[PDB]
Write a protein that binds this ligand. Structure first.
Ligand SMILES: [K+]
Ligand SMILES: [K+]
Ligand SMILES: [Mg+2]
Ligand SMILES: [Mg+2]
Ligand SMILES: [Mg+2]
Ligand SMILES: [Mg+2]
Ligand SMILES: [Mg+2]
Ligand SMILES: [Mg+2]
Ligand SMILES: [Mg+2]
Ligand SMILES: [Mg+2]
Ligand SMILES: [Mg+2]
Ligand SMILES: [Mg+2]
Lengths: 740, 740
């Protein structure tokens, strides 16, 4: 039948919560604004703002340049969507048989091509708008976090997390509202044809990850080229401190945090939210929910998202108001509490949403067959994905925090040089993948068993049902990182930079956890999409042991390595040029090393700007062209193979790269902090140990900030892309097999 | 029906070719024995012979320790095979109906439990013998190659390559002869039941790879703990030549080339020969050849191998006689011409074999159905594998030879630190996987389409039909390594080490090529055995989109990383110990650095012995217990996922590990040789560049020598294990799903 919550209640609840979310984000922005500063001790406060503006400008300058290219591609690709999807029915204007029920009549395919194009641009534009906001808050709160470190750790933490929360809640509340609006607009046209409505809607997730792919890779290349170049000439060669205003690469470095770690990461996670929702929507759309036009249950994913915002609001209070940090050793435990608190609160929240927004019995589309499903079983589906994420977080903290043996052993290995650091870090990351895969596998079993592709898609949404807290703890990191850079560039005391270093180290672990959630839910949503693709393409069986499927499987598995090779070599070449420029200045600019002369910052921003824009194109092309090339030339069976192989394979290298990189970084931080006998034993800064740690750190740079986190996008992009173009592929694809 | 070559002919041809192969091997050993030496300039001949005996005593000593444990595991596991296989039919002795033809009576499953246990023992013993014979010729030729370098590269090349050819021809002939003997012996029992005869024979490949896994990993840890320790302290820290006799780790280092690179590699490759032949034989046994009891066609793979021995003998003469080398740039193109001549000669050879050993039409078992296949279609299956090999060879060379831009840019990247060197090598390896994958996929498609699992098994055998030559160019490598090691320890002329350094660099490429052939054919044979497993397990369909299969798939893709984490951490830990020990002697033994006092070589041998023997157990357990654990607990459908997933995933990390390690090695070799302006400007030895190169090389050491080459064994091993245990898993498996 129907549920306790009436459709009208759902129609109110969803945007009410979105607006509560947007409201809450503006509140925290206002609080952060209470910290005053301007560029026209008090003398520090002007240097801090003079610096913030250098970064703010540089960040903005890059994103605008990046957006110019990405928006053009967005428009070109939106045309490809219209053409290809429009061509299935010969661009007819008449209705046809429903793909999901020949007895019924649907809206014309050509209408769906148009709405798929529309939802795509919606998603593309919402994606670019996601990273840009996050950059604005990050570049607003960075210097404000510096200044508040003149009052202790706990105060600086607060403004960084408040600001992290601003990014998290704006992104979460705005992605939900745009979807909700899109759905309801689209509905005026589609009427009773919900199947085609949400099939149109799925372009939203395609729009998101498409633009996110270029943000993560483009921003990733900008930031890490500067990162390696600055750190190498500065710390390893000239023995000057990290983030030293003498170093001409420090602006690009700190611009880079916002441009990649914030902007790219923001878009990245939006794509995760959107795909997850869309996936749950397309499967529900042709299940009992959509066939019986029951709006509430249909919009179950958005309802879960809405309560999610509320829960995270309550949670955030525990760190921003209810509690104060006194000891550096409290920072990480504080951040982790957010995960634990919200996971527990949300377990209750989903129980409630399940109990009032679902019928006790319904059906779920199951490869041609309605499957009998109980609401307590959907409860377990979203719950298993929610807990899988907490587990993933806990494991990721274990392998990347310097408060535990794995990372401490790695710092230790510096006693014998960079070579043993690199060897220990590689092995650490390979080691780190075990439990996450297991968490994911359990998630898949539990969710697949209960509710087919819907359960999986809803388990993915489950893992991202706390997306606002997740983003907040993550965005806090690059905000903290920028803060310690403003400290060192304004020549503030040793006491200041020690506090930001404690915050930054926590944000390193935070960033790996985000990377983990991104990878965990990507694996889930991609499987759901893979399944929905197989159905929509009218494949009977994806039989592993057939030539078309296997060559697909083995080639698809090779894809994330190819992508890695591009992006790694990309940073490797750009970083090589950066080293040469920093040297050129330290060697040919008189008085520079002395501290009397000014470094040419712009040259370093130009080097990493030139490299990122030229070199984001091939890996993007690789990921967008593959579904099309394989789908057109080889056919849906093969594209099925490519979808399975790139999922199972790309996940191992994504987890291991991000963790290895995170580890080398925090090992390096450990030595630099000297907060224990062992830590001090490997120092001081400048030591042979410390330098080995820096070598390891800078190899981890592209691994965890360019190639690593982007690999989760490669997977989930190719998956929607395949789902969206499925009708085209099944009709007009397979060419090499037809013409022979 | 019958073919041009009568059953009796085939019975004669095969062992005659094994005997011809064994005679060739002995002949070369004889010629190499002409280089006379002994430990009773003249001092320089004497010093070489004392160094040779340190190494020989060392390598013989270790393998015996290793074989003690491996041999014990071999016996334990044979018991498990007997128990688990015999338990299928309640250890009954009553004959039952042939599952391939119910009108016939077959030998009891108990008989197959016994004969599987026997073939496993044969296989593991042969594997043990293969690696031992390899070490023995290597530890004989090593110093003879040193003395011959006094007369120049060409003469030295000859005795190193003649020697590699000794190992190659023995291993190939003895491997073929054993399999041939086993088949005929078993037939006395099975009579007309060739289904079960050849199902018994499949244990041979299982025993072969089982022992190889331990050989490869044990020897791998031994040698790379030494290598990394020696190089880092000696070259990077104490500024002394590589392989300096003052360095305490040098004897272990050189022992290790014989113990991993030779014994482990030899065993590894034998496993590939046994498995590929075994897979071809099982599918044939329940196809028209086995069912119609046609011996010649049934033994088609052993005939291909017989003709391969002959073809390789002729090919060998081109490098051994018909041409001498006069310049260093002629070394690599000679080794490559071995590949090219053998490939061309074997295409003819296989056309001939296919013309006279097969009837023009026959059927091949294809998942229940007899599939109509023609003899020229089988020609293409082995030839596509054969040609895929050569392609893999050319591409691997382009990526690991310092005569090309990939490695030279890597050497060049040293100019900016160890960090950039590592980033370039990591990127290089990721880049390298692409074409071999395509070669493999094309191989799979062509062979899969034409003759299902038999075609694939025969493509694998195709890739390895030139196994004598393949081994010869490979085993040549560690022999050239020892030669330069002996040269440095004997304080011989610099002109001597310049020559061996040219030989050694060639063998670095050759080693990567050998790695590629092993990986390429591992993927082929594993897919063949996957499909055979599926029939044997009575699986109707491996559908990727089931909960049971998918979880297997994603977990299976993770195994290759779990394995890499273990092996990497092991070498990393043992190397750390080695460095400490080497430092201790340099820092505390008076006279050592000054060449007055003698270092202690035994402590270094003891550290690498202690670590290899202990730490080879867990990764061996992971590989061998996985099929048993997943099979018993989850069932055959989940095991299916694990096989697909570990194949497509392991193959990528194996390729990139091996090539990255190869790249770094030859990069530093390029700097060490300064044979162009570019190379010279990165020098001289000891420069900041050289030391970045050395770091990279040492990170590469475990990647290409412990972890990398073993992954191919993980892959192909979990496949025969599953095929062999399929009846046990089908019947008594999937407990978790039965108790719920
Ligand atoms: K960070
Ligand atoms: K070698
Ligand atoms: Mg840095
Ligand atoms: Mg940064
Ligand atoms: Mg920084
Ligand atoms: Mg960091
Ligand atoms: Mg960094
Ligand atoms: Mg070495
Ligand atoms: Mg060696
Ligand atoms: Mg050597
Ligand atoms: Mg070498
Ligand atoms: Mg080495």
């Amino acid at each position: 039948g129907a549920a306790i919550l009436p459709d009208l209640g759902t129609e109110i609840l969803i945007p009410v919560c979105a607006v509560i979310g947007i409201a809450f984000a503006l509140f925290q922005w206002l609080l952060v604004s209470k910290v005053k500063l301007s560029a026209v001790d008090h003398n520090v406060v002007v240097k801090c703002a003079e610096i913030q503006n250098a970064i703010s400008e540089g960040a903005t300058s890059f994103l605008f340049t990046e957006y110019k290219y990405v928006g053009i591609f967005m428009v070109a690709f939106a045309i490809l969507i219209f053409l290809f999807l429009g061509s299935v029915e010969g661009f007819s204007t008449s209705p046809q048989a429903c793909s999901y029920d020949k007895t019924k009549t649907c809206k014309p395919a050509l209408a769906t091509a148009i709405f798929s194009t529309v939802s795509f641009l919606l998603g593309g534009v919402t994606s670019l708008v996601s990273g840009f906001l996050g950059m604005k808050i990050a570049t607003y709160a960075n210097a404000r976090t510096t200044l508040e470190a003149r009052k202790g750790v706990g105060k600086a933490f607060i403004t960084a997390f408040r600001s992290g929360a601003v990014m998290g809640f704006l992104l979460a509340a705005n992605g939900l509202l745009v979807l909700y609006i899109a759905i309801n607009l689209f509905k005026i046209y589609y009427g009773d044809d919900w199947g085609g409505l949400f099939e149109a809607i799925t372009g939203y997730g395609l729009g998101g990850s498409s633009m996110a792919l270029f943000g993560r890779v483009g921003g990733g290349i900008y930031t890490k080229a500067a990162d390696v170049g600055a750190d190498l000439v500065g710390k390893v060669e000239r023995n000057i401190p990290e983030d030293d205003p003498r170093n001409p690469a420090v602006i690009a470095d700190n611009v880079g945090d916002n441009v990649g770690d914030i902007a790219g990461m923001g878009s990245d996670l939006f794509g995760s939210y959107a795909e997850s929702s869309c996936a749950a929507l397309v499967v529900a759309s042709i299940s009992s929910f959509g066939l019986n036009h029951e709006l509430t249950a249909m919009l179950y994913p958005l309802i879960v998202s809405s309560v999610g915002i509320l829960v995270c609001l309550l949670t955030t209070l525990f760190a921003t108001d209810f509690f104060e940090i006194k000891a550096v050793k409290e920072i990480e435990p504080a951040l982790k509490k957010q995960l634990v608190i919200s996971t527990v609160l949300m377990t209750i929240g989903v129980a409630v949403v399940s109990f009032v927004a679902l019928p006790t019995s319904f059906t779920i589309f199951n490869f041609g067959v309605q499957k009998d499903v109980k609401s307590w079983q959907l409860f377990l589906c979203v719950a298993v994905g929610l807990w899988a994420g907490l587990i993933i977080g806990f494991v990721t903290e274990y392998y990347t925090s310097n408060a535990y043996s794995p990372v401490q052993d790695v710092a230790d290995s510096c006693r014998t040089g960079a070579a043993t650091n690199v060897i220990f870090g590689l092995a650490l990351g390979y080691k780190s993948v075990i439990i996450p895969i297991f968490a994911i596998a359990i998630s898949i079993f539990v969710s697949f068993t209960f509710a087919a592709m819907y359960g999986i898609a809803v388990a993915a949404l489950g893992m991202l049902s706390t997306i606002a807290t997740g983003l907040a703890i993550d965005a806090y990191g690059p905000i903290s990182d920028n803060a310690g850079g403003i400290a060192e560039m304004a020549g503030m005391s040793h006491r200041i930079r020690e506090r930001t270093d404690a915050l930054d180290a926590a944000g390193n672990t935070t960033a790996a956890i985000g990377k983990g959630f991104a990878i965990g839910s990507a694996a889930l949503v991609s499987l759901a999409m893979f399944g929905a693709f197989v159905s929509r393409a009218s494949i009977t069986t994806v039989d592993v042991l057939t030539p078309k499927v296997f060559i697909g499987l083995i080639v698809g598995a090779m894809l994330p390595y190819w992508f890695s090779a591009m992006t790694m070599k990309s940073v490797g070449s750009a970083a090589l040029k950066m080293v040469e420029e920093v040297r050129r200045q330290f060697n040919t600019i008189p008085g520079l090393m002395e501290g009397t002369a000014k470094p040419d910052y712009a040259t370093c921003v130009k080097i990493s700007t030139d490299a990122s824009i030229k070199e984001m194109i091939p890996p993007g092309a690789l990921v967008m062209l593959t579904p099309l090339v394989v789908g057109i030339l080889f056919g849906v069976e093969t594209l099925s193979g490519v979808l399975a192989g790139s999922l199972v394979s790309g996940v191992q290298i994504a987890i291991s790269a991000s963790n290895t990189g995170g580890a080398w970084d925090n090992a390096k931080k450990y030595i630099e902090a000297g907060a224990s006998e062992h830590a001090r034993s490997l120092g001081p800064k400048g030591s042979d140990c410390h330098k080995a740690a820096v070598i390891g750190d800078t190899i981890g740079d592209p691994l965890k900030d360019t190639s690593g986190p982007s690999l989760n996008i490669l997977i989930k992009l190719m998956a929607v892309e395949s789902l969206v173009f499925a009708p085209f592929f099944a009709t007009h694809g397979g060419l090499l097999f037809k013409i022979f």
